[PDB]
Automatic annotation (TrEMBL):
<feature type="binding site">
    <location>
        <position position="33"/>
    </location>
    <ligand>
        <name>Ca(2+) 3</name>
    </ligand>
</feature>
<feature type="binding site">
    <location>
        <position position="175"/>
    </location>
    <ligand>
        <name>Ca(2+) 5</name>
    </ligand>
</feature>
<feature type="binding site">
    <location>
        <position position="33"/>
    </location>
    <ligand>
        <name>Ca(2+) 1</name>
    </ligand>
</feature>
<feature type="domain" description="PET hydrolase/cutinase-like">
    <location>
        <begin position="2"/>
        <end position="258"/>
    </location>
</feature>
<dbReference type="GO" id="GO:0052689">
    <property type="term" value="F:carboxylic ester hydrolase activity"/>
</dbReference>
<feature type="binding site">
    <location>
        <position position="251"/>
    </location>
    <ligand>
        <name>Zn(2+) 8</name>
    </ligand>
</feature>
<feature type="binding site">
    <location>
        <position position="48"/>
    </location>
    <ligand>
        <name>Zn(2+) 3</name>
    </ligand>
</feature>
<feature type="binding site">
    <location>
        <position position="49"/>
    </location>
    <ligand>
        <name>Zn(2+) 3</name>
    </ligand>
</feature>
<keyword id="KW-0378">Hydrolase</keyword>
<keyword id="KW-0862">Zinc</keyword>
<feature type="binding site">
    <location>
        <position position="203"/>
    </location>
    <ligand>
        <name>Zn(2+) 9</name>
    </ligand>
</feature>
<protein>
    <submittedName>
        <fullName>Cutinase</fullName>
    </submittedName>
</protein>
<feature type="binding site">
    <location>
        <position position="205"/>
    </location>
    <ligand>
        <name>Zn(2+) 8</name>
    </ligand>
</feature>
<feature type="binding site">
    <location>
        <position position="205"/>
    </location>
    <ligand>
        <name>Ca(2+) 5</name>
    </ligand>
</feature>
<feature type="binding site">
    <location>
        <position position="161"/>
    </location>
    <ligand>
        <name>Zn(2+) 7</name>
    </ligand>
</feature>
<feature type="binding site">
    <location>
        <position position="139"/>
    </location>
    <ligand>
        <name>Zn(2+) 5</name>
    </ligand>
</feature>
<feature type="binding site">
    <location>
        <position position="159"/>
    </location>
    <ligand>
        <name>Ca(2+) 4</name>
    </ligand>
</feature>
Length: 262
């Protein structure tokens, strides 16, 4: 069987609930931690099903972990260790945010608490970020091709070409984004991603550049699904991903469906 499957069989209500089947504890990471600006480790408390994978969540330009805080309980309650991080400075560039996503992942694996270490499978790590943090999520996978999943949310980056990414990438964009317009960022990024890569692109109808900062079930249900499918190799969630979702909130959805099991 799949030794990484956690929780009951998924239903579209289970991927949409604010609280998943797991109960979450936290650990404050002080900013004096080396390589990044600290953050908050949300982790599941039930250890009887085995350890979990982890995702590091990066904020945007001039932002902090508060803008990403809702992902903490929302995602970790479904079977993941969620690290909402701060950056070294509020003004760090997307390339810097990739290093600090990896620096936070090193901290989970190498330096975190026994509470967190004992619940962590250090082989299953993912990245996710907002805006310049999303460009850092793309930068992180170029720097660490062994990452399991990458979710750039309304991503912003100068470089448009990611033709050597090997990590399954899920780019979410905002229809009315004029800070990182999807015609020049999100869609070019997704298009230049390898056509053989497990990848999807979800555009939210009438959303702004700051929609990933407000709780959104359309984002959460398919962020949880994408992590389940690629961090847990849990094909029970392939149903919600392939074929493409038809949600009313979604204005456009491209993908390399189906995501055959590698
Ligand atoms: Ca630091
Ligand atoms: Cl602090």
């Amino acid at each position: 069987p799949n030794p990484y499957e956690r929780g009951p069989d998924p239903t579209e209500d289970s991927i949409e609930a604010i609280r998943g089947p797991f109960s979450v504890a936290t650990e404050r990471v002080s900013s004096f931690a080396s390589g990044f600006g600290g953050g908050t480790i949300y982790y599941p408390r039930e250890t009887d099903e085995g350890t979990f994978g982890a995702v590091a969540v990066a904020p945007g330009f001039t932002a902090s972990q508060g803008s990403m805080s809702w992902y903490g309980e929302r995602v970790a309650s479904h079977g993941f260790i969620v690290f909402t991080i701060d950056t070294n400075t509020r003004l760090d560039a997307p390339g810097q945010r990739g290093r600090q996503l990896l620096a936070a992942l090193d901290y989970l694996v190498e330096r975190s608490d026994r509470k967190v270490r004992e619940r962590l499978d250090p082989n299953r790590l993912a990245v996710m970020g907002h805006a310049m943090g999303g460009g850092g999520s793309l930068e992180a996978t170029v720097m660490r091709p062994s990452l399991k999943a990458s979710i750039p949310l309304t991503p912003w980056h100068l470089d448009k070409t990611w033709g050597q990414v090997q990590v399954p990438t899920f780019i979410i964009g905002a229809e009315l984004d004029t800070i990182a317009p999807v015609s020049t960022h999100a869609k070019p990024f997704y298009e230049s991603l390898p056509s053989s890569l497990p990848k999807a692109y979800m555009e939210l109808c009438g959303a702004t550049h700051f929609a990933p900062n407000i709780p959104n079930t359309t984002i959460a249900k398919y962020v949880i699904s994408w992590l389940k499918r690629f961090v847990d190799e849990d094909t029970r969630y392939s149903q919600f991903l392939c074929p493409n979702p038809t949600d009313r909130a979604i204005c456009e959805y491209r993908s390399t469906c189906p995501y055959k099991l590698n």
